[PDB]
Amino acid sequence: GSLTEDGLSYKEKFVVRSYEVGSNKTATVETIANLLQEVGCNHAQSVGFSATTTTMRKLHLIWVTARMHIEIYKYPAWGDVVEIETWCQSEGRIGTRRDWILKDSVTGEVTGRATSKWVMMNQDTRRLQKVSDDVRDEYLVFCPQEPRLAFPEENNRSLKKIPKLEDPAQYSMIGLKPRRADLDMNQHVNNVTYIGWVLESIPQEIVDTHELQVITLDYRRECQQDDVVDSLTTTTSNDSQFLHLLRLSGDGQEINRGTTLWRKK
Amino acid sequence: GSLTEDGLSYKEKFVVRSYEVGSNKTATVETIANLLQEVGCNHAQSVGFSATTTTMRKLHLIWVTARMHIEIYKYPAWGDVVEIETWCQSEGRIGTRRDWILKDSVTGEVTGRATSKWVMMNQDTRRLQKVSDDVRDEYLVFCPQEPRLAFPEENNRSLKKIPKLEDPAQYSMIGLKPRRADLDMNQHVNNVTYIGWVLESIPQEIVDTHELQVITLDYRRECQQDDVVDSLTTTTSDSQFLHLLRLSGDGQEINRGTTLWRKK
Ligand SMILES: Cn1cc(N)c(C(=O)NC2CCC2)n1
Ligand SMILES: Cn1cc(N)c(C(=O)NC2CCC2)n1
């Protein structure tokens, strides 16, 4: 991969691997989620990062995902090359936004797009805070000045308020635990695991006859290595829509909430 | 990736990804296991396959892993390029063997090696079958004639008989279930999940102070999508462990193995 000519975005090509595909022989949404994560890491490394700035490590501050939104028009097949372009943008003192565009390397058409909202948090106390002026200027040089939105639309699906699932849920997957493969280099559960865990409550019949089009996920609390999750789902709707909820098995503390949209094959 | 000049092996370079590494910022043994699996698929595709031969698809026959053995000297770091060379060989009518050599793309040194024993099963009845001729000949053109062994040594770790763990186990991880990410394109639990599941019973204190050097795993039975596994471990000794994966209910054995760890 490499930065574009202006140095205000990064591109990377990935060949889809055999273990990265599902039953339809196309990449899973978790493979896509992993690829977006990977290109974001390479973008951060290519501009002198490790993505904590000078003032962030001084104050023990980290970026945390608050929301992920992914829309896929076509899933790349096993053996195909997918090109992903990623960039970041300041959202004032609220946090940062990271966008992605997925393309077929052969045709050059947009086969998917994603958007994420990141908030600043103290690594130790876990307390959210607004972006300071000294920190905002440190990352502003790596961002476009004019708005560059992967989801421009005057009423897009990425900004909708997600309601909380009411008990009883229509479908559920109980007793979900993360293994060492689910943890990142800092021993925290990878953000992509929550996506997989959310989808565990969707019935296998829907997965066999439908393709996942859109997924919106709100990250409320992190699941520890020794925590147990419960995935809950209810159909709300040629298109099926679901409301989702991930919570701790014990106290029932909410850790994630979201919605998915599926279309008939 | 591509086949070598003689067409009797395949090579491929992989850049280690950020989500593929552990706390030491080096690739996990499951990332390595995934890479070996991937290079084996590309090798099979590059020589005209869909590794099912002509006779095999007519008879509803598949290759299944009976044994996996991996030895790592150095784990590639996040950002490093690892080159893997893989090849197949016949072992008479008992089955097939697949070997791998892992190398650092910069220095060219051997940083790891693996060997696997594959047996021929009937997809539907799940019944083991010996490798008859005709199907033996159909694939012997893609294999070296003289023995090419990643583990040559007479009396090496890859050929040792693994005993069955006795109850009670010293360490255990219970209630393990596969998710959709753990399944392959045919909806079967990926062989690499069993490796991860085996390692779930190793205490986090050993993982934090030791590096995994060798792992030998015997595949006895497949775990279904709706099955629940129990991972059991006992220290037998460098630290050495005896492992056992079994179904939560009936306690049916699905996998057994051993791991060797060195102090950091
Ligand atoms: C720690 N980190 C770096 C990233 N680039 C991501 C990231 O984009 N995560 C989302 C969740 C679906 C992919 N997370
Ligand atoms: C379906 N398939 C093709 C392969 N080449 C492998 C394979 O080598 N798997 C082993 C166990 C983890 C490494 N499995």
Swiss-Prot record, chain B:
Q: What chemistry does it catalyse, as a reaction equation?
A: (9Z)-octadecenoyl-[ACP] + H2O = (9Z)-octadecenoate + holo-[ACP] + H(+)
Q: What is its main location?
A: plastid
Name the enzyme group at the top EC level: hydrolase
Per UniProt, which keywords does this protein have?
A: Chloroplast, Fatty acid biosynthesis, Fatty acid metabolism, Hydrolase, Lipid biosynthesis, Lipid metabolism, Plastid, Transit peptide
Asked whether the UniProt record includes Plastid among its keywords, one would answer: yes
The Gene Ontology terms for molecular function here are: fatty acyl-[ACP] hydrolase activity
On whether Hydrolase is a keyword of this UniProt record, the answer is yes
Where is the protein situated, by its record's location annotation?
Plastid, Chloroplast
Q: Name one GO biological process term.
A: fatty acid biosynthetic process
GO CC terms of this entry: chloroplast
| Enzyme Commission designation | 3.1.2.14
Q: Which domain of life is it from?
A: Eukaryota
Q: Where is the active site?
A: N186, H188, C223
Family, per entry: Belongs to the acyl-ACP thioesterase family.
Q: What does this protein do?
A: Plays an essential role in chain termination during de novo fatty acid synthesis. Possesses high thioesterase activity for oleoyl-ACP versus other acyl-ACPs. Substrate preference is 18:1 > 18:0 > 16:1.
What name does the UniProt record give this protein? Oleoyl-acyl carrier protein thioesterase 1, chloroplastic
Instruction: Name the species this protein comes from.
Output: Arabidopsis thaliana
Instruction: Tell me the part of the parent protein that is shown.
Output: 75 to 359 of 362
